[PDB]
RNA sequence: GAGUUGAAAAUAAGCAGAGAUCCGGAGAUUCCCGAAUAGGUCAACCUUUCGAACUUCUGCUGAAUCCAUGGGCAGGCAAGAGACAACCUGGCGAACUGAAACAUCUUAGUAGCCAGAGGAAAAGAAAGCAAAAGCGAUUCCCGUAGUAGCGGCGAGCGAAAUGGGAGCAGCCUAAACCGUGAAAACGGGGUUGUGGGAGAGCAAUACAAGCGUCGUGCUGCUAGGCGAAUCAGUGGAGUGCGGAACCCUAGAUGGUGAAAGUCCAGUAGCCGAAAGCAUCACUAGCUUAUGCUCUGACCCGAGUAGCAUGGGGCACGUGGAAUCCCGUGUGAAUCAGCAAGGACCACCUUGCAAGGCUAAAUACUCCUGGGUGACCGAUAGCGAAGUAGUACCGUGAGGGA
RNA sequence: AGUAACGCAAACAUUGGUGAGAAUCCAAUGCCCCGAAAACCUAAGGGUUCCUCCGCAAGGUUCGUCCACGGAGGGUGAGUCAGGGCCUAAGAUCAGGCCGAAAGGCGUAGUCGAUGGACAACAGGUGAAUAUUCCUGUACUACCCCUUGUUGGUCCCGAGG
RNA sequence: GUAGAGAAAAUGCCUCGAGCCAAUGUUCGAGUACCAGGCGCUACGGCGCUGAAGUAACCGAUGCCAUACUCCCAGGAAAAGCUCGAACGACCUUCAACAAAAGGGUACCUGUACCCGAAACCGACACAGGUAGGUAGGUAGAGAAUACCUAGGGGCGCGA
C-alpha cells in the first residue's frame, strides 16, 4: 500500500479544477519514499519507506519514539 | 503401522447376498458367488471379511460400481471348498 | 387428497386428544343413527373418528381372488365423528359428559358428571 | 424392561459385546435373502441396542475427560484395527 | 396418560402400566463435499507415514562482525479465518435525468462493488452554542423555516440558535516530581477548568456507587393439568327453526353430516417443574476523592494549530469565506498562554486541542411468539395453496412457468 | 381445411404365421441397395437407450400385436487394455518476496496439468444382455518367502541416457 | 585403460578387431486344438459322435528394419524412470543389497453395458446436415475415384 508506516498519511481524495470548474478526479498521494535509515540500536540501516513528514519526526523525536508509536521494527 | 485404504468398519462391508438364476448358475459353475458391497470397499476387505467371516479361503474378488451407485463383487472361492455346499448353510 | 393428509409438526402428525377411550360404552349423540349404544373398537386418533361396533353400515363390494372367483361383498363398519359420543354405564343407563378426578391413591381417573360411576374401572 | 447391565458392563466386555451385537445383525441381514422372517420382531431391537453401548462407553469416557476431537481420534484408532469374527451363532 | 413403529394401507414382527407413541431441559453420535483443514481435486473424489497456513506459548538458535538479532527447526496448545433479509460505518463511486440543448450545478455522494461489526451501529462528554441575558455530553420527533441563505442568483439546494419532548451517565489515561532500571520500562500521586494538578496541616473518616466469588430467594420462559351448563320434534344430517332447561371471572377461537356457552379440543380463573435461561434483590470481598486552607509561578497530549499552496465538506457553487478535515513545504505558545465568537484588528464573553472508552431514546426484517385486518382468495395473494427456483431454456451469468 | 403435407427418384413382392384386428411384427423364398460403406471397432458425448417378459392411453407425421414409448425384473467382473497411485510441455496456482482504495496484480522454489515420455497377455472357448475382464493352455511385471555368499546401506548429490 | 582423482567432458596408446544393426527364419507354444464333410434327435433353432488335407509359385503393401540412408534449411519439448560414482554424505550384514534357485505364494482404486460416417451425440423433431482415429477384400483401373460384387448390413417407416 502507499501508507506510511510511521503515520496514516494516505493519499488525498482531491479533485483538480480546471478553469472553466470542470472537476476531474485525479487522486493525489504523499511522497513516501524508499530510504534506509541507520537504527543505531542495532548499530545498522534498516530499509524503509518513509512519508517525508515522518522522517523530519524521527529526526526532531529520535526514531525508537516513532517506532513504538506505529510498533514496526523487525 | 498398518491402515485399511479407508475405514469402513469391516462389518458394514458386505451388505446381502444376489438371488438372481444366473448368480445360482455362477455358484454352480464356478465356485463363485455374489455379494452386494457399499461403495468404499477393496479387495483387501472384501477378500479379508471372507476367509475370516465363513472360514474359506478365496482366490478372486472381482468387484464392479454398478450404474445406479452400489458395488457387485462376485468372489471366486479356492477349488478346494466348493460354492453350492457352501451357500447351503447360508440358504441358497 | 393433498387437502386433507396428517398435519405434521416437523416430522409428525398432530394426534389432536379425545375423551373416548378404546373399549368405551358410548351413546351416539347426534348423527345420523341418533340414540345408539356401542362399544368402540379402533379409534383413529388424527381425525377423531372412531369405530363403534355394529352401528354405521357400510355396503361395500371386494374384488377377491385373481381369476374374477368370488369377489363376494362385505359389509364393514366405518367411522363416525368423536364429538357425537357420549357415554353410558348400563347401571346409570344415561349419557353423560367426562370429568376428572385424583382418587385416593396418586391415579387419576375418568368421573361421568352427571352420576357417580368411574369410567376408568380397573387398570384392565 | 431395560438394559441395567451394560453400565455394570467394564471397558472389554462392553466392546467385544459391540462386536458381537454387529456379527448377530450381519446374520439377520443374510437371513433376509433365503426369507426366515422372524426378523421384524427382533432386528431393529440388536441395531438399537449396540447405540446403548456406544452411548454407554461415551458418558464412562467423560466423566474420565476427554474432548470429541480426542476421541474422534482414539475411536479411528479402534475402528482400524479389528478382524470380522464368525457370530456366535453357528 | 394410553395404545403405538413419520405422509398414504397393508405388509412383518415388535414395544408398552415392572410408563410404549408423545411433549420438554440438558447431553452423545453427527459418513462425504463445502472456511475445508493430511497432500492434490474436475466438489460430495484419489494418495495418504492420519495430521492445515496465521497468531500464541516452550525449546534449536542462519547470514554476516561466534555479537546482538529476525528468519528456520521442532514439541505446543486451540483462538482469526467462512454465512447473512434489511438497518449501520468506511473506502471507491457512476449515468440516464432536471436545467425544456449543455459543458458550473442537479439526479448524488444516490445506485452498485469491495471491507468490517452489531443487535443495534455511528456520535458523545465541550479548545461547544450563545449574547450583556442564559445554556450546558451525545442521538432522535415536533417546530422555528421552504424562513436566513446559497445558486450559469438559472434548475434547484436549504440551515441553525432560542422553544417543546423521548432518553439521560459519566470515567480511564499523557507529562510535573517519588520508589526501580541489565540506562527502554512497570509501580504510586494526576486529571479539572470565572484554573485545576507536582508543593504545606488532621483527632484514628463514613455514607455512596460500580464490579466480581461463587451462593441464596421469589418473578417470568422451555413441557402440562383441573376447568360450568340441556333435551326433545322437524327433515338424508341440526349447531338453524317451534317448544322446554341451565351456565356465565367461561357467548374469544377450530372443528363436529347444517350455522350452536351447555358435542369436542378448549377459554376466564387456578395449580406447575428436574434441568437450562432470563430481569431484579440480598448475605460476605476489592473499590469510592476534592474533609480544608492558604504563597509559588515547573509541567497543561509537538513536527500538531497556524501560515503559502491544492482541495473536500460544511445549507453555503471561491466568493469578505469563517469554523471542519486532508496532499506538498516551512513550522509556534502554553495559562502576566492558546482557540472560537462568519476576512482581519482590538476589548469583552465562552472553551480550553493535538490520547481513549461509554447504556438509553434511534433505523431494520430472511425471521419466532401473541393479536388485528372496510387485505387476496386459484390468471389474486409470495414467482411458488401438490417432488417451485421444480420442469424447461442458456456453455455461462441468468430467465422461469 | 379435411386443404398443403407425410422429410429425397435403394424397391419391394409373395406364401405361412401371431392376433379381435396385418402393406407396416416374425420366419422363409425371391428381387434389390451400400460395400473407402447405408460394414466392424474406438476417443468424446449421451446416460439406462442394452437384455427378458407384459402393455398399449399419449409419442411414431399412416398402421401396430411393434418399438429407442409405459410398467416390472435384470445387466456392464482386468496385476497386463485406458486413467490414477510415475514424469513433465502450453498453461494454471504460486509459500515466502515485491506492488496496489479494498478485492487484487507481477513473480521464484514448489504443486497440479496431458493431447506426450516410463511401464506387464495372447489364442480358443462360453453365453438374453460382459468378456485382451469369466474358463482352459501358455506367458510377462512388481513385492515378499527359502539358500550361498559380500557386510556394507538407501537418500540428497555429480554424470550418461 | 592412464594423464588434470568416481562418472561421463576433454589427451594419447592400445585391445586373436573385425564384424556389429533389424524385421523376417527355425523349434517349441499347437504330437493340440480348429475344421469342410458324415450319421441321429428336434416342440423344425439346437446338440450329439466322427472328422480327411492342412502344402507350394506369383504379386503386393498408404504395417515392419526406420529417429536405415541421402538431401535439404526453416535447424525440430521437457522431466522422470533406467545405467555408471566423488565430502567413498545421515545409516551400518539387527533393520542391507546383489548372481541366485528364473523355485513357492500374493497382486491397489476408477472406466468396461448400448449408440458411436449415429432414429438415441451436436443442429429445438425418429432434422435428405455436421462429428477425431483404426481395418481395408474381388474384377477392370495408374488409384483409398469410378462400375459391378464378397464379408457385413439395409429396402429408407404413409399407401393404392
Request: hydrophobic share 35%; with cysteine.
Given at each position: 500500500?502507499?501508507?506510511?508506516?510511521?503515520?496514516?498519511?494516505?493519499?488525498?481524495?482531491?479533485?483538480?479544477?480546471?478553469?472553466?470548474?470542470?472537476?476531474?478526479?485525479?487522486?493525489?498521494?504523499?511522497?513516501?519514499?524508499?530510504?534506509?535509515?541507520?537504527?543505531?540500536?542495532?548499530?545498522?540501516?534498516?530499509?524503509?519507506?518513509?512519508?517525508?513528514?515522518?522522517?523530519?519526526?524521527?529526526?526532531?523525536?529520535?526514531?525508537?519514539?516513532?517506532?513504538?508509536?506505529?510498533?514496526?521494527?523487525? | 503401522?498398518?491402515?485399511?485404504?479407508?475405514?469402513?468398519?469391516?462389518?458394514?462391508?458386505?451388505?446381502?447376498?444376489?438371488?438372481?438364476?444366473?448368480?445360482?448358475?455362477?455358484?454352480?459353475?464356478?465356485?463363485?458367488?455374489?455379494?452386494?458391497?457399499?461403495?468404499?470397499?477393496?479387495?483387501?476387505?472384501?477378500?479379508?471379511?471372507?476367509?475370516?467371516?465363513?472360514?474359506?479361503?478365496?482366490?478372486?474378488?472381482?468387484?464392479?460400481?454398478?450404474?445406479?451407485?452400489?458395488?457387485?463383487?462376485?468372489?471366486?472361492?479356492?477349488?478346494?471348498?466348493?460354492?453350492?455346499?457352501?451357500?447351503?448353510?447360508?440358504?441358497? | 387428497?393433498?387437502?386433507?393428509?396428517?398435519?405434521?409438526?416437523?416430522?409428525?402428525?398432530?394426534?389432536?386428544?379425545?375423551?373416548?377411550?378404546?373399549?368405551?360404552?358410548?351413546?351416539?349423540?347426534?348423527?345420523?343413527?341418533?340414540?345408539?349404544?356401542?362399544?368402540?373398537?379402533?379409534?383413529?386418533?388424527?381425525?377423531?373418528?372412531?369405530?363403534?361396533?355394529?352401528?354405521?353400515?357400510?355396503?361395500?363390494?371386494?374384488?377377491?381372488?385373481?381369476?374374477?372367483?368370488?369377489?363376494?361383498?362385505?359389509?364393514?363398519?366405518?367411522?363416525?365423528?368423536?364429538?357425537?359420543?357420549?357415554?353410558?354405564?348400563?347401571?346409570?343407563?344415561?349419557?353423560?359428559?367426562?370429568?376428572?378426578?385424583?382418587?385416593?391413591?396418586?391415579?387419576?381417573?375418568?368421573?361421568?358428571?352427571?352420576?357417580?360411576?368411574?369410567?376408568?374401572?380397573?387398570?384392565? | 424392561?431395560?438394559?441395567?447391565?451394560?453400565?455394570?458392563?467394564?471397558?472389554?466386555?462392553?466392546?467385544?459385546?459391540?462386536?458381537?451385537?454387529?456379527?448377530?445383525?450381519?446374520?439377520?441381514?443374510?437371513?433376509?435373502?433365503?426369507?426366515?422372517?422372524?426378523?421384524?420382531?427382533?432386528?431393529?431391537?440388536?441395531?438399537?441396542?449396540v447405540a446403548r453401548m456406544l452411548t454407554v462407553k461415551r458418558e464412562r469416557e467423560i466423566e474420565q475427560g476427554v474432548g470429541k476431537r480426542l476421541s474422534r481420534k482414539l475411536d479411528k484408532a479402534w475402528k482400524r484395527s479389528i478382524v470380522?469374527?464368525?457370530?456366535?451363532?453357528?
Amino acid at each position: 500500500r502507499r501508507i506510511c508506516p510511521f503515520t496514516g498519511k494516505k493519499s488525498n481524495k482531491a479533485n483538480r479544477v480546471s478553469h472553466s470548474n470542470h472537476k476531474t478526479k485525479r487522486l493525489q498521494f504523499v511522497n513516501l519514499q524508499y530510504k534506509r535509515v541507520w537504527w543505531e540500536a542495532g548499530k545498522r540501516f534498516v530499509k524503509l519507506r518513509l512519508s517525508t513528514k515522518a522522517l523530519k519526526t524521527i529526526e526532531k523525536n529520535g526514531l525508537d519514539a516513532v517506532a513504538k508509536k506505529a510498533g514496526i521494527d523487525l | 503401522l498398518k491402515y485399511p485404504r479407508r475405514i469402513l468398519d469391516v462389518y458394514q462391508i458386505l451388505q446381502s447376498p444376489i438371488i438372481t438364476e444366473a448368480a445360482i448358475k455362477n455358484i454352480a459353475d464356478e465356485n463363485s458367488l455374489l455379494f452386494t458391497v457399499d461403495v468404499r470397499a477393496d479387495k483387501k476387505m472384501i477378500r479379508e471379511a471372507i476367509s475370516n467371516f465363513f472360514g474359506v479361503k478365496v482366490r478372486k474378488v472381482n468387484t464392479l460400481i454398478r450404474p445406479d451407485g452400489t458395488k457387485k463383487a462376485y468372489i471366486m472361492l479356492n477349488k478346494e471348498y466348493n460354492a453350492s455346499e457352501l451357500a447351503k448353510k447360508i440358504g441358497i | 387428497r393433498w387437502e386433507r393428509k396428517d398435519c405434521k409438526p416437523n416430522s409428525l402428525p398432530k394426534l389432536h386428544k379425545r375423551h373416548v377411550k378404546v373399549g368405551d360404552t358410548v351413546k351416539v349423540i347426534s348423527g345420523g343413527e341418533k340414540g345408539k349404544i356401542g362399544e368402540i373398537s379402533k379409534i383413529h386418533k388424527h381425525n377423531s373418528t372412531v369405530i363403534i361396533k355394529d352401528l354405521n353400515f357400510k355396503t361395500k363390494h371386494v374384488k377377491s381372488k385373481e381369476e374374477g372367483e368370488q369377489g363376494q361383498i362385505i359389509k364393514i363398519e366405518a367411522a363416525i365423528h368423536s364429538s357425537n359420543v357420549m357415554l353410558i354405564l348400563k347401571e346409570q343407563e344415561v349419557a353423560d359428559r367426562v370429568g376428572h378426578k385424583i382418587l385416593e391413591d396418586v391415579r387419576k381417573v375418568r368421573y361421568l358428571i352427571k352420576t357417580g360411576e368411574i369410567v376408568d374401572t380397573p387398570d384392565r | 424392561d431395560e438394559l441395567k447391565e451394560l453400565r455394570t458392563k467394564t471397558n472389554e466386555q462392553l466392546n467385544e459385546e459391540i462386536l458381537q451385537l454387529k456379527g448377530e445383525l450381519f446374520m439377520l441381514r443374510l437371513q433376509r435373502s433365503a426369507r426366515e422372517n422372524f426378523k421384524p420382531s427382533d432386528f431393529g431391537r440388536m441395531r438399537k441396542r449396540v447405540a446403548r453401548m456406544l452411548t454407554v462407553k461415551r458418558e464412562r469416557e467423560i466423566e474420565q475427560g476427554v474432548g470429541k476431537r480426542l476421541s474422534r481420534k482414539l475411536d479411528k484408532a479402534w475402528k482400524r484395527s479389528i478382524v470380522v469374527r464368525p457370530p456366535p451363532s453357528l
